[PDB]
Amino acid sequence: KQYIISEELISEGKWVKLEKTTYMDPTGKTRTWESVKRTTRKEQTADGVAVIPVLQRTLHYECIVLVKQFRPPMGGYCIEFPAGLIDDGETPEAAALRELEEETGYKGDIAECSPAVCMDPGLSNCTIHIVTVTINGDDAENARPKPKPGDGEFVEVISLPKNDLLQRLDALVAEEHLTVDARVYSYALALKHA
Amino acid sequence: KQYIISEELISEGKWVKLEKTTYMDPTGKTRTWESVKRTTRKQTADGVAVIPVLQRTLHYECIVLVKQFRPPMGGYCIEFPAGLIDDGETPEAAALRELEEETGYKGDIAECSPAVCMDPGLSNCTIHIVTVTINGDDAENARPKPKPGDGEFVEVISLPKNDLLQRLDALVAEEHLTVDARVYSYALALKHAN
Ligand SMILES: COC(=O)[C@@H]1C[C@@H](O)CN1C(=O)c1ccco1
Ligand SMILES: [Mg+2]
Ligand SMILES: [Mg+2]
Ligand SMILES: [Mg+2]
Ligand SMILES: [Mg+2]
């Protein structure tokens, strides 16, 4: 019943634009919305990937590998799944493994790959694939893992046990000003609930 | 080590603005970021999202979700019930209100996240994730009455918690819908637990 009638550019940066979106409501009436989009999306099936990296090691509880970085939009440090935009021609899987290595040093193995999922669909068209990767922490490749941060990338690795993820996140939030990402919090809540 | 120096307004709508953020990178080099912010924040966070468990005896527990046309997305999305927190409303009260408006269900608060970020590489948007249980055997949730605001058009989709990820993949396969990243993350962790 509902559909887009027109998308009018309001303001375009190098990376992000704002649009006036006109669409048809399900009563047959024309309405508008203010929409955000990235300028970087080409033929990618989504803007980006986020990696759920399950670190597995003999006689250790499984950990979820997270990253902490300063996020200018937020004016502060955030704790997130490793993530980045998908390069043109790159597959979501390749992007996930590459970003995981760049941000954490770990070399993972693909487990699963989501369909494209929406980041904040009342605001933006941004989408990611959520890629689950296992990391064999008993492999020598993953023994002394060093981030390969790109230019202006400064990332800290935080590995937390899956079996206590929500409380460990709460403890980090209790101890400094930082924001946990909504996907990470959602994943930790489901762990607790299951 | 990192911090905001200045924010330059690029463009301001009624609901969203685009800024150019200047910040200090950890080497001591000054850098810029294009950032989105909402114009509506006053609040602990911009919004709430509700994780609503429909608990009925002799039935599977269900997670209650909503499907709506999302103009930024150009299509229909499957999401946790959600909306912006009114000036002077608590996140818990917003959560019960939105859940009732969007689903007709009347629920009880179980727990409340701290403010969590939506897409911190792009925006400052935050929400509280509010876990709510719904006693599906109570008379008030027998024939749930959804009270949409102006221009909201919301379908309710309840899915069993124990098979949430498979059920969501199936809807994406069959219905050409976009699942929300937070919903998908929760669903993943229900499978990944233990
Ligand atoms: C153990 O029984 C429960 O009901 C747990 C405990 C409480 O934290 C909420 N909860 C959920 O499972 C839930 C609510 C929404 C989605 O899941
Ligand atoms: Mg990244
Ligand atoms: Mg990166
Ligand atoms: Mg809503
Ligand atoms: Mg609403």
PDB file of C-alpha atoms in Angstrom, chain B residues 40-185:
ATOM      1  CA  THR B  40      14.068  16.817  19.117  1.00  0.00           C
ATOM      2  CA  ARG B  41      16.198  15.772  22.087  1.00  0.00           C
ATOM      3  CA  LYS B  42      15.606  17.730  25.380  1.00  0.00           C
ATOM      4  CA  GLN B  43      15.724  13.309  27.872  1.00  0.00           C
ATOM      5  CA  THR B  44      18.063  10.390  28.880  1.00  0.00           C
ATOM      6  CA  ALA B  45      18.051   9.382  25.142  1.00  0.00           C
ATOM      7  CA  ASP B  46      16.121  10.156  21.968  1.00  0.00           C
ATOM      8  CA  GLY B  47      13.884   7.127  22.108  1.00  0.00           C
ATOM      9  CA  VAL B  48      12.980   3.773  23.556  1.00  0.00           C
ATOM     10  CA  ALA B  49      12.733   0.376  21.968  1.00  0.00           C
ATOM     11  CA  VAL B  50      10.746  -2.256  23.688  1.00  0.00           C
ATOM     12  CA  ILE B  51      11.533  -5.933  23.794  1.00  0.00           C
ATOM     13  CA  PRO B  52       8.005  -7.305  24.505  1.00  0.00           C
ATOM     14  CA  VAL B  53       7.582 -10.971  25.492  1.00  0.00           C
ATOM     15  CA  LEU B  54       4.003 -12.275  25.021  1.00  0.00           C
ATOM     16  CA  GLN B  55       3.721 -14.891  27.785  1.00  0.00           C
ATOM     17  CA  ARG B  56       0.636 -17.140  27.547  1.00  0.00           C
ATOM     18  CA  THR B  57       0.248 -20.379  29.422  1.00  0.00           C
ATOM     19  CA  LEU B  58       0.438 -23.542  27.315  1.00  0.00           C
ATOM     20  CA  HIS B  59       1.859 -21.529  24.407  1.00  0.00           C
ATOM     21  CA  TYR B  60       5.291 -20.678  23.279  1.00  0.00           C
ATOM     22  CA  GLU B  61       6.632 -17.357  24.549  1.00  0.00           C
ATOM     23  CA  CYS B  62       6.554 -14.851  21.736  1.00  0.00           C
ATOM     24  CA  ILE B  63       8.450 -11.689  21.015  1.00  0.00           C
ATOM     25  CA  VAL B  64       6.071  -9.039  19.768  1.00  0.00           C
ATOM     26  CA  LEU B  65       7.273  -7.023  16.804  1.00  0.00           C
ATOM     27  CA  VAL B  66       5.927  -4.422  14.478  1.00  0.00           C
ATOM     28  CA  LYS B  67       5.985  -3.945  10.712  1.00  0.00           C
ATOM     29  CA  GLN B  68       5.693  -0.424   9.251  1.00  0.00           C
ATOM     30  CA  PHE B  69       6.589   1.397   6.061  1.00  0.00           C
ATOM     31  CA  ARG B  70       9.788   3.356   6.720  1.00  0.00           C
ATOM     32  CA  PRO B  71      10.267   6.246   4.362  1.00  0.00           C
ATOM     33  CA  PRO B  72      14.068   6.446   4.765  1.00  0.00           C
ATOM     34  CA  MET B  73      14.190   2.768   3.870  1.00  0.00           C
ATOM     35  CA  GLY B  74      11.758   2.965   0.939  1.00  0.00           C
ATOM     36  CA  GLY B  75      10.058  -0.142   2.255  1.00  0.00           C
ATOM     37  CA  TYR B  76       8.687  -2.140   5.100  1.00  0.00           C
ATOM     38  CA  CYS B  77      10.756  -2.999   8.183  1.00  0.00           C
ATOM     39  CA  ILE B  78      10.295  -5.379  11.056  1.00  0.00           C
ATOM     40  CA  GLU B  79      11.231  -3.777  14.398  1.00  0.00           C
ATOM     41  CA  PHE B  80      10.778  -3.791  18.154  1.00  0.00           C
ATOM     42  CA  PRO B  81       7.979  -1.363  19.102  1.00  0.00           C
ATOM     43  CA  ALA B  82       9.577   2.000  19.585  1.00  0.00           C
ATOM     44  CA  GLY B  83       9.268   5.688  19.626  1.00  0.00           C
ATOM     45  CA  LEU B  84      10.747   8.919  20.861  1.00  0.00           C
ATOM     46  CA  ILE B  85      10.569   9.789  24.575  1.00  0.00           C
ATOM     47  CA  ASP B  86       8.226  12.837  25.226  1.00  0.00           C
ATOM     48  CA  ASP B  87       9.734  15.898  27.051  1.00  0.00           C
ATOM     49  CA  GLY B  88       9.393  15.011  30.774  1.00  0.00           C
ATOM     50  CA  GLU B  89       8.511  11.307  30.223  1.00  0.00           C
ATOM     51  CA  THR B  90      10.623   8.561  31.813  1.00  0.00           C
ATOM     52  CA  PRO B  91      12.024   5.810  29.535  1.00  0.00           C
ATOM     53  CA  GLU B  92       9.879   3.187  31.319  1.00  0.00           C
ATOM     54  CA  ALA B  93       6.701   5.195  30.814  1.00  0.00           C
ATOM     55  CA  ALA B  94       7.563   5.868  27.181  1.00  0.00           C
ATOM     56  CA  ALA B  95       8.061   2.108  26.744  1.00  0.00           C
ATOM     57  CA  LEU B  96       4.697   1.199  28.132  1.00  0.00           C
ATOM     58  CA  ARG B  97       3.064   3.944  26.193  1.00  0.00           C
ATOM     59  CA  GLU B  98       4.629   3.052  22.873  1.00  0.00           C
ATOM     60  CA  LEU B  99       3.983  -0.613  23.375  1.00  0.00           C
ATOM     61  CA  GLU B 100       0.312   0.088  23.969  1.00  0.00           C
ATOM     62  CA  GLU B 101      -0.049   2.517  21.089  1.00  0.00           C
ATOM     63  CA  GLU B 102       1.733   0.317  18.598  1.00  0.00           C
ATOM     64  CA  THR B 103       0.529  -3.138  19.755  1.00  0.00           C
ATOM     65  CA  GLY B 104      -2.458  -2.606  22.120  1.00  0.00           C
ATOM     66  CA  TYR B 105      -0.616  -4.716  24.669  1.00  0.00           C
ATOM     67  CA  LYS B 106      -0.297  -3.664  28.299  1.00  0.00           C
ATOM     68  CA  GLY B 107       2.937  -4.794  29.798  1.00  0.00           C
ATOM     69  CA  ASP B 108       5.143  -4.708  32.846  1.00  0.00           C
ATOM     70  CA  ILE B 109       8.702  -3.442  33.005  1.00  0.00           C
ATOM     71  CA  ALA B 110      11.333  -6.100  33.602  1.00  0.00           C
ATOM     72  CA  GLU B 111      14.536  -4.130  33.071  1.00  0.00           C
ATOM     73  CA  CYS B 112      16.004  -1.012  31.457  1.00  0.00           C
ATOM     74  CA  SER B 113      19.189  -0.398  29.564  1.00  0.00           C
ATOM     75  CA  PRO B 114      21.316   2.730  29.970  1.00  0.00           C
ATOM     76  CA  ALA B 115      21.218   4.992  26.904  1.00  0.00           C
ATOM     77  CA  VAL B 116      22.688   2.917  23.990  1.00  0.00           C
ATOM     78  CA  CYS B 117      23.776   4.187  20.608  1.00  0.00           C
ATOM     79  CA  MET B 118      21.960   3.512  17.368  1.00  0.00           C
ATOM     80  CA  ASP B 119      24.655   4.125  14.739  1.00  0.00           C
ATOM     81  CA  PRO B 120      27.530   5.919  16.401  1.00  0.00           C
ATOM     82  CA  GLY B 121      29.693   6.272  13.234  1.00  0.00           C
ATOM     83  CA  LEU B 122      26.940   8.359  11.788  1.00  0.00           C
ATOM     84  CA  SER B 123      24.660   9.875  14.419  1.00  0.00           C
ATOM     85  CA  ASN B 124      24.334  10.725  18.035  1.00  0.00           C
ATOM     86  CA  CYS B 125      21.018   8.858  18.252  1.00  0.00           C
ATOM     87  CA  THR B 126      20.360   6.888  21.382  1.00  0.00           C
ATOM     88  CA  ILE B 127      17.671   4.804  22.946  1.00  0.00           C
ATOM     89  CA  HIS B 128      16.810   2.899  26.057  1.00  0.00           C
ATOM     90  CA  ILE B 129      16.059  -0.738  25.453  1.00  0.00           C
ATOM     91  CA  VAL B 130      13.210  -1.687  27.753  1.00  0.00           C
ATOM     92  CA  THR B 131      12.413  -5.342  28.365  1.00  0.00           C
ATOM     93  CA  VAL B 132       8.703  -5.824  29.146  1.00  0.00           C
ATOM     94  CA  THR B 133       6.664  -8.898  29.845  1.00  0.00           C
ATOM     95  CA  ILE B 134       3.081  -9.112  28.672  1.00  0.00           C
ATOM     96  CA  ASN B 135       0.661 -11.350  30.576  1.00  0.00           C
ATOM     97  CA  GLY B 136      -1.229 -12.656  27.616  1.00  0.00           C
ATOM     98  CA  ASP B 137      -3.795 -14.462  29.871  1.00  0.00           C
ATOM     99  CA  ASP B 138      -5.096 -11.178  31.429  1.00  0.00           C
ATOM    100  CA  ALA B 139      -8.331  -9.757  30.198  1.00  0.00           C
ATOM    101  CA  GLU B 140      -6.754  -6.441  29.217  1.00  0.00           C
ATOM    102  CA  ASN B 141      -4.522  -8.292  26.626  1.00  0.00           C
ATOM    103  CA  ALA B 142      -7.298 -10.495  25.289  1.00  0.00           C
ATOM    104  CA  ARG B 143      -8.334  -8.277  22.379  1.00  0.00           C
ATOM    105  CA  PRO B 144      -5.366  -5.870  22.324  1.00  0.00           C
ATOM    106  CA  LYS B 145      -6.453  -2.355  21.060  1.00  0.00           C
ATOM    107  CA  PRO B 146      -3.548  -0.505  19.098  1.00  0.00           C
ATOM    108  CA  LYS B 147      -3.863   3.323  19.481  1.00  0.00           C
ATOM    109  CA  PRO B 148      -1.807   4.766  16.543  1.00  0.00           C
ATOM    110  CA  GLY B 149      -0.907   8.464  16.518  1.00  0.00           C
ATOM    111  CA  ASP B 150      -1.491  10.583  13.389  1.00  0.00           C
ATOM    112  CA  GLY B 151       0.171   9.012  10.303  1.00  0.00           C
ATOM    113  CA  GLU B 152       1.292   5.777  12.022  1.00  0.00           C
ATOM    114  CA  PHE B 153       0.245   2.502  10.407  1.00  0.00           C
ATOM    115  CA  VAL B 154       1.577  -0.456  12.334  1.00  0.00           C
ATOM    116  CA  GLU B 155       1.052  -4.238  11.872  1.00  0.00           C
ATOM    117  CA  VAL B 156       1.790  -6.515  14.779  1.00  0.00           C
ATOM    118  CA  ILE B 157       3.827  -9.707  14.226  1.00  0.00           C
ATOM    119  CA  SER B 158       4.366 -12.062  17.141  1.00  0.00           C
ATOM    120  CA  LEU B 159       7.016 -14.682  16.771  1.00  0.00           C
ATOM    121  CA  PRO B 160       8.034 -17.504  19.019  1.00  0.00           C
ATOM    122  CA  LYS B 161      11.144 -16.596  21.045  1.00  0.00           C
ATOM    123  CA  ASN B 162      12.564 -20.168  20.745  1.00  0.00           C
ATOM    124  CA  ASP B 163      12.767 -19.999  16.901  1.00  0.00           C
ATOM    125  CA  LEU B 164      13.003 -16.210  16.391  1.00  0.00           C
ATOM    126  CA  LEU B 165      15.966 -16.157  14.005  1.00  0.00           C
ATOM    127  CA  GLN B 166      14.551 -18.874  11.696  1.00  0.00           C
ATOM    128  CA  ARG B 167      11.201 -17.159  11.680  1.00  0.00           C
ATOM    129  CA  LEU B 168      12.708 -13.802  10.782  1.00  0.00           C
ATOM    130  CA  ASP B 169      14.832 -15.233   7.972  1.00  0.00           C
ATOM    131  CA  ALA B 170      11.620 -16.803   6.650  1.00  0.00           C
ATOM    132  CA  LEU B 171       9.787 -13.494   6.602  1.00  0.00           C
ATOM    133  CA  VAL B 172      12.700 -11.835   4.798  1.00  0.00           C
ATOM    134  CA  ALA B 173      12.745 -14.754   2.252  1.00  0.00           C
ATOM    135  CA  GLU B 174       9.039 -14.675   1.568  1.00  0.00           C
ATOM    136  CA  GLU B 175       7.895 -11.063   2.246  1.00  0.00           C
ATOM    137  CA  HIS B 176      10.820  -8.782   0.923  1.00  0.00           C
ATOM    138  CA  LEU B 177      11.014  -6.926   4.277  1.00  0.00           C
ATOM    139  CA  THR B 178      14.045  -5.541   6.181  1.00  0.00           C
ATOM    140  CA  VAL B 179      14.637  -6.779   9.708  1.00  0.00           C
ATOM    141  CA  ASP B 180      15.993  -4.317  12.209  1.00  0.00           C
ATOM    142  CA  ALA B 181      19.596  -4.798  13.358  1.00  0.00           C
ATOM    143  CA  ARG B 182      18.682  -4.816  17.010  1.00  0.00           C
ATOM    144  CA  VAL B 183      15.944  -7.401  16.455  1.00  0.00           C
ATOM    145  CA  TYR B 184      18.382  -9.536  14.428  1.00  0.00           C
ATOM    146  CA  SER B 185      21.100  -9.224  17.020  1.00  0.00           C
TER     147      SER B 185
END
